[PDB]
Design a protein around this ligand. Structure first.
Ligand SMILES: CC(C)(COP(=O)(O)OP(=O)(O)OC[C@H]1O[C@@H](n2cnc3c(N)ncnc32)[C@H](O)[C@@H]1OP(=O)(O)O)[C@@H](O)C(=O)NCCC(=O)NCCS
Ligand SMILES: CC(C)(COP(=O)(O)OP(=O)(O)OC[C@H]1O[C@@H](n2cnc3c(N)ncnc32)[C@H](O)[C@@H]1OP(=O)(O)O)[C@@H](O)C(=O)NCCC(=O)NCCS
Ligand SMILES: OC[C@H]1O[C@@](CO)(O[C@H]2O[C@H](CO)[C@@H](O)[C@H](O)[C@H]2O)[C@@H](O)[C@@H]1O
Ligand SMILES: OC[C@H]1O[C@@](CO)(O[C@H]2O[C@H](CO)[C@@H](O)[C@H](O)[C@H]2O)[C@@H](O)[C@@H]1O
Ligand SMILES: [Co+2]
Ligand SMILES: [Co+2]
Lengths: 152, 149
């Protein structure tokens, strides 16, 4: 009974993000936006996460992509790009990731993700499938996909 | 530099398995080769550098349509650089640079999505971080280079 929350942006949460490995420019810019406009302290972001106690313990970033110019699904439908899916050490294999994933699935929209190489078994379980490689489209990503009428 | 266009064949496809950034690209190529789709010794977006008859470094380079990829001024086209890598025992000897410089030699802008810890090398190649655009980037951390005329 560990629920998914939309994460609010603030110095505290940005501090939490530094504990995650998949940290990069999204985080840097978030910080920059916050220090430039106070009105966006305690605002929402593309991130959803799970908390144990009051520590952020697992996160995931979500955005709906225009499928018209990203040909992944049947006759070019929009899908959710899922990224930065991560659970801190000491809290893995406990189902937080699966919980975050099924949350994304609750939107009843196709999903694309570009995972880590040493965590492909986890996605096998989430019932995602490898795309057919298209060098012009995929260019050195190894995208995984999912759509309704696969694994709820 | 001693850079070279890599030719697809079981021999070099085997050598690829020595590199860590190995995925579906290679997998697609292997079956395309063996299912007779492509021809033996056909070209690829890969370029590489040998030491002896051992493939030591490689990158995949491809000209991208800048219309649907707004990364540079006046939506011009650019080359996507990826899977760039050098085998252990050969790192920090110039091979990596040699490839990046081969790419740069065509005077087109270059975009690459780098590997975690490799930040410091890219900085030495004068690649710069794009001002992050969530809709465009989505948890990529793109780096761009363009020639300064
Ligand atoms: C990938 C990651 C998001 C999943 O962790 P998690 O959400 O707590 O895992 P879950 O409990 O939700 O996984 C669902 C199921 O898949 C399995 N699974 C999870 N991690 C796995 C692993 N890395 N290898 C093989 N199977 C795995 C689990 O056994 C789990 O239970 P079930 O199959 O019995 O139903 C998380 O471990 C992470 O943040 N990764 C860390 C860095 C990394 O990529 N390393 C992976 C190896 S440690
Ligand atoms: C970075 C990489 C892709 C190719 O680069 P390379 O061929 O090994 O390095 P090069 O000799 O061509 O780079 C030339 C310059 O980059 C610098 N450089 C390369 N890797 C570096 C690093 N990890 N940290 C600091 N500087 C680095 C070299 O010090 C050298 O600097 P100099 O000209 O001022 O003396 C290669 O190291 C690699 O495939 N490693 C993969 C593992 C990884 O990502 N970790 C980083 C290296 S341990
Ligand atoms: O207060 C009840 C319960 O909620 C927790 C964890 O779910 O609160 C966390 O989530 C809140 C939702 O916005 C955050 O405001 C808060 O920072 C975070 O702790 C726990 O604190 C508590 O057990
Ligand atoms: O023009 C070079 C010619 O020779 C080949 C092999 O016959 O050489 C390349 O590949 C070899 C390993 O497969 C390397 O030993 C060699 O250094 C490299 O040039 C062909 O690629 C090419 O037809
Ligand atoms: Co030459
Ligand atoms: Co530049």
């Amino acid at each position: 009974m560990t629920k998914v929350e939309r994460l609010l942006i603030n110095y505290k949460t940005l501090e939490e993000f530094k504990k995650f490995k998949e940290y990069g420019i999204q985080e840097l810019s978030m910080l920059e936006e916050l220090q430039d406009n106070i009105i966006e302290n305690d605002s929402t972001s593309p991130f959803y996460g799970i908390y144990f106690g009051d520590k952020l313990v697992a996160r995931m970033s979500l955005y709906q992509v225009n499928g018209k110019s990203n040909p992944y699904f049947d006759n070019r439908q929009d899908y959710l790009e899922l990224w930065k899916l991560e659970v801190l050490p000491g809290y893995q294999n406990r189902g937080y990731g699966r919980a975050l994933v099924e949350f994304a699935k609750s939107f009843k929209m196709p999903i694309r993700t570009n995972p880590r190489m040493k965590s492909a078994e986890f996605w096998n379980k989430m019932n995602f499938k490898t795309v057919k490689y298209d060098m012009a489209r995929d260019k050195g990503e190894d995208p995984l996909i999912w759509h309704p009428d696969m694994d709820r």
